[PDB]
Amino acid sequence: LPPAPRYFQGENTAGFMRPVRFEGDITNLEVVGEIPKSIEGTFYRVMPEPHLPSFIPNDPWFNGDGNISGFYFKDGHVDLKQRYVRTEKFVREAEARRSLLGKYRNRYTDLVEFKIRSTANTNIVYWRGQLLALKEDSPPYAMDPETLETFGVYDFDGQLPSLTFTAHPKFDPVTREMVCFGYEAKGDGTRDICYYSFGPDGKIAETVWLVSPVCGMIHDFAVTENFVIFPIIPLVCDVERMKQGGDHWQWDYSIPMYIGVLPRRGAQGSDVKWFEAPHGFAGHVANAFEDDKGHIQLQMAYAKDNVFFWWPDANGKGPRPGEVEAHFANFVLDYQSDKLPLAEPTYLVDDDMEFPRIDDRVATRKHKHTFFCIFDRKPGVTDFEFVMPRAGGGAPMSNGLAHLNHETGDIQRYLPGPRKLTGECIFIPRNSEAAEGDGYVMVLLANYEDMCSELAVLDTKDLTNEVALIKLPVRLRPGLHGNWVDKSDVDGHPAPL
Amino acid sequence: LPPAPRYFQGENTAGFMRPVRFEGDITNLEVVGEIPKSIEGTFYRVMPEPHLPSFIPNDPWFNGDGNISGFYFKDGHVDLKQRYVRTEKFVREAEARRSLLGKYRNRYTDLVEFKIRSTANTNIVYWRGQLLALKEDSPPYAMDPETLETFGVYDFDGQLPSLTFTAHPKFDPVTREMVCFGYEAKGDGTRDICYYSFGPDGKIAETVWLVSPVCGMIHDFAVTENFVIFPIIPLVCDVERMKQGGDHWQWDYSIPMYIGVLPRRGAQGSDVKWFEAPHGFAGHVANAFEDDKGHIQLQMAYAKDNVFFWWPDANGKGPRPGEVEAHFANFVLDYQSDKLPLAEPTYLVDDDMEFPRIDDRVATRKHKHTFFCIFDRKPGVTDFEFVMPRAGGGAPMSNGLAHLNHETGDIQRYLPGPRKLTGECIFIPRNSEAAEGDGYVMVLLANYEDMCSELAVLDTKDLTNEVALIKLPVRLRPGLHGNWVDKSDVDGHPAPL
Ligand SMILES: Oc1ccc(/C=C/c2cc(O)cc(O)c2)cc1
Ligand SMILES: Oc1ccc(/C=C/c2cc(O)cc(O)c2)cc1
Ligand SMILES: Oc1ccc(/C=C/c2cc(O)cc(O)c2)cc1
Ligand SMILES: Oc1ccc(/C=C/c2cc(O)cc(O)c2)cc1
Ligand SMILES: Oc1ccc(/C=C/c2cc(O)cc(O)c2)cc1
Ligand SMILES: Oc1ccc(/C=C/c2cc(O)cc(O)c2)cc1
Ligand SMILES: Oc1ccc(/C=C/c2cc(O)cc(O)c2)cc1
Ligand SMILES: [Co+2]
Ligand SMILES: [Co+2]
């Protein structure tokens, strides 16, 4: 077999990116300041964290085993519990004591035949009493919210219609539906998208099969009262290339950024309209809603070139690390229109941004607050000379959070400091009467001075100030998505505004 | 109540001394070099590691909750499992989410009444299929060697005759007895010593009650074929001082270093002879044996002043940090003699040393190899300017290991490097045919550059070279004692030479 290295090597596992690979508990975390005593619930986040050194050199960050962190808050105290998802990959590699799964989303490079290739490393959501650990090439893995035990692959009591389940399902705060999809839904390189939903009782509601114009990556989507919307990143899959050992994804400079719009209820697959936005990268969706004319306002991070530069075009062409910025865009779509080409979007702020969150009590409806990561190159915001040699590679950098009030246009910015970077934030309503966007924001920090992680708690009344800074004595490697599950919410999700 | 601090403060919890407080697993540790594939067994070590910040300022290192590390070796792979002993203190403080136990060995400063005040933080030994987590003011806590679950306080099937069980029992490799004692055996300030032993079947064998001339600290002891030997450190306890909030221990410059000798089998308490060595600190025993004349050769670390300088005499007199050296001493004792004063010992090497280990297959008999920690002040051995500001305080420093061959007088020295310090080592016989002192040495390193811990594996054929260096991504705080449990030893202890 290709040799099994016995320590980590390469930039993707160097410095702050070096895997720790711990599972267990650290209770009664150290706190500077004071955690508001009324906060009660759990912040769950997932990170890619290779459990064994890869036989693939420079294996991308996206291919690392999912490790789940839970931060359990009560009466101003906080405990950490941490555990790897027991994927098929995790278990078989643990039994063998060596890596067996090969290249990202390329089964032809695996050393054994896997049934499920999930790393379950991209999002961790709450649904009907379980956590669901998500990875867009796979069904979810179900887990226990209290112990982080893995129950196994989850197929929704045999109802799951698709091979694949998106990392970005949406929770309708009014209907309590979980609205879902999968792309490549019939296997590697397929153009099949399966759109499907579940009612709060767990029964499947929608199931619609549609066809994408290209086999492109649909990482995120959007949901409004009457529509679902599929923005396609111009990374394209050819299974014949994969059979020869090639990459699953390859950029295509010749295509638009497709944005499909389908009626949310009762549609057939031929009802989808593939609108054509100017060529660019479809980043995360903040939220979408229908305005008073019935037009879709789609607000999302949007870049003009390939953010995932390690998967360049057919001729190896694309940008370098740190070159491509993404911006907070508003696209207007009208399902009634037969005009496919769309105008350049308008931009809500100027910051290089990503990982937008809203108050999910207005998800799918008009929102007026967004919280997001920023990367500010302004001199002195990040001490790059100190940070970069300690940082490793392979993951995006964020050196602050911003809060946009969409009514007033005011922006507040949280800067953790010159030798700290942030992950994706979560928003927590102050209480069940709180107005939209009023409450607390939490965000994990990488402290490059200590080479430790910290968890910051902010009040939305003044985002610039830490009310509490929770000081971890270990590193939590840069991660992907996370969510708050409030103790006062019976189904784990907040009540509609 | 005295307020409960929410983060650690003070020199004893700063830098490398900052508690981590993690429990759980890190499997398949990163390895540089190659761990000999024939090594099979587990290295257990215990560290004091406060689970909650103390309400006592500058609480000594010796008062921290015991956390057990196991390093499980097979076929050149190694896994870490780590878990706190569930002492009464640990559990009640965990329930309250605050510290409740007060000063070291002073129950009058506790916030609640404890039955058992053990931190179980000093040694971790194997006996009859369990681990015993030891602390000299208490009975042992029994634990599972595989899972590190705590079973509870252990009383040897109701046979334990003493309130206290030493951290340094000796395992007779010929009789397979565990030879034990406790001082302050009837409670705080008592001069009662209970000497007791267990056969390999678990049945109590010896039980002798004796009386110490002062209530002095007896941290370690020695066992020969026909004698047991009790060296008393000139720290003395007065319970009236404790009732006023004072220290359990206070140095007494006016007394000798007492060395009691008792016949090993069949004695009464009045058979003890209290010999009087020149005033000094009784450090760890390497081993003791009877020579051809029937005289006891007692080989032990010995200093001329108070190593535990934070507990000075009644007038605050005592040395400063880093001042006192201990040396490898040989005391000759003759139980037949009626002369109580003893001569100055001879010294086996020049090094400032401690934490001596032998090949325990000759424990209680003549040994000719000792492995020990050294602290070399020679310029450049340790880069103090880099290390000291990162080190914190409260624990002893060792910047090498030494191996003394007692027949030839040859010494080899292992120096991990200018920015690394060591803990106490373990010795592992090469196999069951190996000659005395032939095999492997393991030692945990603090790497002040990375602020990580490492586990070094050395071959006794060349102590200067690391065969393997196991690279932990977390800190294990400086600890106390540890032991090897070989997989080929059914009862956990090696076969006699
Ligand atoms: O398997 C995976 C597939 C896709 C992803 C996407 C990640 C991602 C990361 C960003 O910084 C911006 C973004 O818009 C998306 C993660 C894992
Ligand atoms: O503490 C400090 C940390 C970083 C800096 C950076 C300065 C700088 C100056 C430029 O003209 C361009 C730039 O991209 C950066 C200054 C002070
Ligand atoms: O969503 C993402 C956005 C940006 C990146 C950057 C990756 C990267 C990889 C390297 O080898 C070096 C580097 O400096 C950066 C990764 C994911
Ligand atoms: O039948 C019994 C008679 C007496 C005892 C005493 C137990 C005891 C335990 C301690 O930790 C401290 C102590 O001072 C006393 C137990 C049983
Ligand atoms: O509760 C406790 C009581 C005593 C001890 C002794 C520790 C010790 C440490 C040294 O550096 C040298 C030594 O000879 C002994 C530890 C814990
Ligand atoms: O908080 C602290 C900050 C700095 C230090 C430095 C200690 C030190 C000790 C030495 O023997 C030599 C040296 O060059 C430095 C200690 C504590
Ligand atoms: O066995 C031992 C030998 C030495 C020591 C040193 C402790 C110490 C405590 C401090 O607060 C500051 C310091 O610089 C050193 C502790 C135990
Ligand atoms: Co995402
Ligand atoms: Co000891």
CSV table of N, CA, C and O in Angstrom, one decimal, chain A residues 100-139:
chain,number,residue,atom,x,y,z
A,100,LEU,N,-6.9,5.1,4.8
A,100,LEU,CA,-7.4,4.2,3.8
A,100,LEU,C,-8.2,4.9,2.7
A,100,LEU,O,-8.1,4.5,1.6
A,101,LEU,N,-9.0,5.9,3.1
A,101,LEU,CA,-9.7,6.8,2.2
A,101,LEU,C,-8.7,7.7,1.5
A,101,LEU,O,-7.8,8.3,2.2
A,102,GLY,N,-8.8,7.9,0.2
A,102,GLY,CA,-7.8,8.7,-0.6
A,102,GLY,C,-8.2,10.1,-0.8
A,102,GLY,O,-8.6,10.9,0.1
A,103,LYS,N,-8.2,10.5,-2.1
A,103,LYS,CA,-8.5,11.9,-2.4
A,103,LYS,C,-9.9,12.3,-2.1
A,103,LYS,O,-10.8,11.5,-2.2
A,104,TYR,N,-10.1,13.6,-1.9
A,104,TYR,CA,-11.4,14.2,-1.7
A,104,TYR,C,-12.4,13.8,-2.8
A,104,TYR,O,-12.2,14.1,-4.0
A,105,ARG,N,-13.5,13.2,-2.4
A,105,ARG,CA,-14.6,12.8,-3.2
A,105,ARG,C,-14.1,12.0,-4.5
A,105,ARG,O,-14.7,12.1,-5.6
A,106,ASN,N,-13.1,11.2,-4.3
A,106,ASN,CA,-12.6,10.3,-5.4
A,106,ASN,C,-12.4,8.9,-4.9
A,106,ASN,O,-11.3,8.4,-4.5
A,107,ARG,N,-13.5,8.1,-5.0
A,107,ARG,CA,-13.5,6.7,-4.5
A,107,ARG,C,-12.5,5.8,-5.2
A,107,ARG,O,-12.0,4.8,-4.7
A,108,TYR,N,-12.1,6.2,-6.4
A,108,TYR,CA,-11.1,5.4,-7.2
A,108,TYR,C,-9.8,5.4,-6.6
A,108,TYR,O,-8.9,4.7,-7.0
A,109,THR,N,-9.5,6.4,-5.7
A,109,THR,CA,-8.2,6.4,-5.0
A,109,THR,C,-8.2,5.8,-3.6
A,109,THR,O,-7.1,5.8,-2.9
A,110,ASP,N,-9.3,5.2,-3.2
A,110,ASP,CA,-9.4,4.6,-1.9
A,110,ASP,C,-8.6,3.3,-1.9
A,110,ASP,O,-8.6,2.6,-2.9
A,111,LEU,N,-8.1,2.9,-0.7
A,111,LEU,CA,-7.4,1.6,-0.6
A,111,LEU,C,-8.3,0.5,-0.3
A,111,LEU,O,-7.9,-0.7,-0.4
A,112,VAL,N,-9.5,0.7,0.1
A,112,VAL,CA,-10.5,-0.3,0.3
A,112,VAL,C,-11.8,0.3,-0.2
A,112,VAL,O,-11.9,1.5,-0.4
A,113,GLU,N,-12.8,-0.5,-0.4
A,113,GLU,CA,-14.1,-0.1,-0.9
A,113,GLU,C,-14.9,0.4,0.3
A,113,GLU,O,-15.3,-0.4,1.1
A,114,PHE,N,-15.3,1.7,0.3
A,114,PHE,CA,-16.2,2.2,1.2
A,114,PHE,C,-17.6,2.2,0.7
A,114,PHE,O,-17.9,2.5,-0.4
A,115,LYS,N,-18.6,2.0,1.6
A,115,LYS,CA,-20.0,2.2,1.3
A,115,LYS,C,-20.3,3.7,1.4
A,115,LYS,O,-21.0,4.3,0.6
A,116,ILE,N,-19.9,4.3,2.6
A,116,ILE,CA,-20.2,5.7,2.8
A,116,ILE,C,-18.8,6.4,3.0
A,116,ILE,O,-18.0,5.9,3.8
A,117,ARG,N,-18.5,7.5,2.3
A,117,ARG,CA,-17.2,8.1,2.4
A,117,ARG,C,-17.3,9.4,3.2
A,117,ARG,O,-16.2,10.1,3.3
A,118,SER,N,-18.4,9.7,3.8
A,118,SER,CA,-18.5,10.9,4.7
A,118,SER,C,-17.4,11.0,5.7
A,118,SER,O,-17.0,10.1,6.4
A,119,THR,N,-16.9,12.3,5.8
A,119,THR,CA,-16.2,12.7,7.0
A,119,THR,C,-17.0,13.5,8.0
A,119,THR,O,-16.6,13.9,9.1
A,120,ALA,N,-18.3,13.7,7.7
A,120,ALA,CA,-19.3,14.4,8.5
A,120,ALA,C,-18.7,15.6,9.2
A,120,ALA,O,-18.9,15.8,10.4
A,121,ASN,N,-18.0,16.4,8.4
A,121,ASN,CA,-17.2,17.5,8.9
A,121,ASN,C,-17.5,18.9,8.6
A,121,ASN,O,-16.8,19.8,8.9
A,122,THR,N,-18.7,19.1,8.1
A,122,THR,CA,-19.1,20.4,7.5
A,122,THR,C,-20.1,21.2,8.3
A,122,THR,O,-19.9,22.4,8.5
A,123,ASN,N,-21.2,20.6,8.8
A,123,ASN,CA,-22.1,21.2,9.7
A,123,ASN,C,-22.7,20.2,10.7
A,123,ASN,O,-22.5,19.0,10.6
A,124,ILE,N,-23.3,20.8,11.8
A,124,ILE,CA,-23.8,20.0,12.9
A,124,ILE,C,-25.0,20.7,13.4
A,124,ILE,O,-25.0,21.8,13.9
A,125,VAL,N,-26.2,20.1,13.1
A,125,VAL,CA,-27.5,20.7,13.3
A,125,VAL,C,-28.3,19.8,14.2
A,125,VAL,O,-28.1,18.7,14.4
A,126,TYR,N,-29.4,20.5,14.8
A,126,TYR,CA,-30.3,19.8,15.7
A,126,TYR,C,-31.6,19.5,15.0
A,126,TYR,O,-32.1,20.4,14.3
A,127,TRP,N,-32.1,18.3,15.1
A,127,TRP,CA,-33.3,17.9,14.4
A,127,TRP,C,-34.0,16.8,15.2
A,127,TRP,O,-33.4,15.7,15.4
A,128,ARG,N,-35.2,17.1,15.8
A,128,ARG,CA,-36.0,16.1,16.5
A,128,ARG,C,-35.2,15.2,17.5
A,128,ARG,O,-35.3,14.0,17.4
A,129,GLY,N,-34.5,15.9,18.3
A,129,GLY,CA,-33.9,15.2,19.5
A,129,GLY,C,-32.5,14.7,19.2
A,129,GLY,O,-31.9,14.0,20.1
A,130,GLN,N,-32.0,14.8,18.0
A,130,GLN,CA,-30.6,14.3,17.7
A,130,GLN,C,-29.8,15.4,17.0
A,130,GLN,O,-30.4,16.4,16.5
A,131,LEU,N,-28.5,15.2,17.0
A,131,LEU,CA,-27.6,16.1,16.2
A,131,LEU,C,-27.5,15.3,14.8
A,131,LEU,O,-27.5,14.1,14.8
A,132,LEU,N,-27.3,16.1,13.8
A,132,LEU,CA,-27.1,15.5,12.4
A,132,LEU,C,-25.8,16.2,12.0
A,132,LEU,O,-25.7,17.4,11.8
A,133,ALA,N,-24.8,15.3,11.7
A,133,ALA,CA,-23.4,15.7,11.3
A,133,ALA,C,-23.4,15.6,9.8
A,133,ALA,O,-23.5,14.4,9.3
A,134,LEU,N,-23.2,16.7,9.1
A,134,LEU,CA,-23.5,16.8,7.7
A,134,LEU,C,-22.3,16.9,6.8
A,134,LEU,O,-21.2,17.4,7.2
A,135,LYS,N,-22.4,16.3,5.7
A,135,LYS,CA,-21.3,16.3,4.6
A,135,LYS,C,-22.0,16.1,3.3
A,135,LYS,O,-22.7,15.1,3.1
A,136,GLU,N,-21.8,17.0,2.3
A,136,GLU,CA,-22.7,17.1,1.1
A,136,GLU,C,-22.6,16.0,0.1
A,136,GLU,O,-23.4,15.9,-0.8
A,137,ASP,N,-21.6,15.0,0.3
A,137,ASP,CA,-21.5,13.8,-0.5
A,137,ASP,C,-22.2,12.6,0.1
A,137,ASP,O,-22.1,11.5,-0.5
A,138,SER,N,-23.0,12.8,1.2
A,138,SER,CA,-23.4,11.7,2.0
A,138,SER,C,-24.7,12.0,2.7
A,138,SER,O,-25.1,13.2,2.8
A,139,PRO,N,-25.4,10.9,3.2
A,139,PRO,CA,-26.4,11.2,4.2
A,139,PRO,C,-25.8,11.7,5.5
A,139,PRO,O,-24.6,11.6,5.7
